Amino acid sequence: SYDTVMDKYWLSQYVIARETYDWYTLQKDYETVGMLSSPSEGQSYASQFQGDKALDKQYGSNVRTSVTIVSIVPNGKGIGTVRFAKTTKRGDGETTHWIATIGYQYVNPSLMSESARLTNPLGFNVTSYRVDPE
């Protein structure tokens, strides 16, 4: 269905933004994840760029981790599975495989601003995020 393609699109945008580490894309991705998730998930995600051992502090412009969406399975019940590959470099770097289990819902778009709808037109909102090894 039409809805299924649309879910895969948002699930993909979400994973790519959350799983990517790139100094020059950092604030935009951090902001994408922020607008795309509930407060509870937002803080949880934010925790890694918080404190002193923050990733940006550690890595800076030296490390880069690119994401490759391999497959996405929406389940039509608010849960989505996303298989993807992570590639980290400072050579070919190290490529690792993972599965993100995502809890998501669409929140009434008419309750946001028009400008906010320019980035999240359908009110896509992530309620829970889980990443596991293969």
Residues within the interface to its own copies (CB under 8 A): 5-6, 8-9, 12, 22-25, 69, 72, 109, 114-115, 117-119, 121-122
101: left (phi over 0), alpha (psi -120 to 50) or beta: beta
The residue behind tokens 């050579």 is 91
CA–CA dist 96, 104 (Å, integer): 25
CB of 24 to its own copies, least distance (A): 4
Instruction: Using the minimum distance from each CB to its own copies, give the nearer residue, 10 or 129.
Output: 10
Residue with smaller CB distance to its own copies, 2 or 77: 2
Residue 75 in tokens:
């389940």
* Nearest residue (CB) to its own copies, 9 versus 50: 9
- Tell the smallest beta-carbon distance from residue 127 to its own copies (Å): 21
Residue 55 or 112 with smaller CB distance to its own copies: 112
Non-local CB neighbours of 84 within 8 Å, separated by 6+ positions: 15, 19, 67, 68, 69, 70, 97, 98, 99, 100
Question: Least distance in Å: CB of 20 to its own copies?
Answer: 11
Find the shortest distance in angstroms from Cβ 6 to its own copies. 6
CB 122 within 8 A of CB 32: no
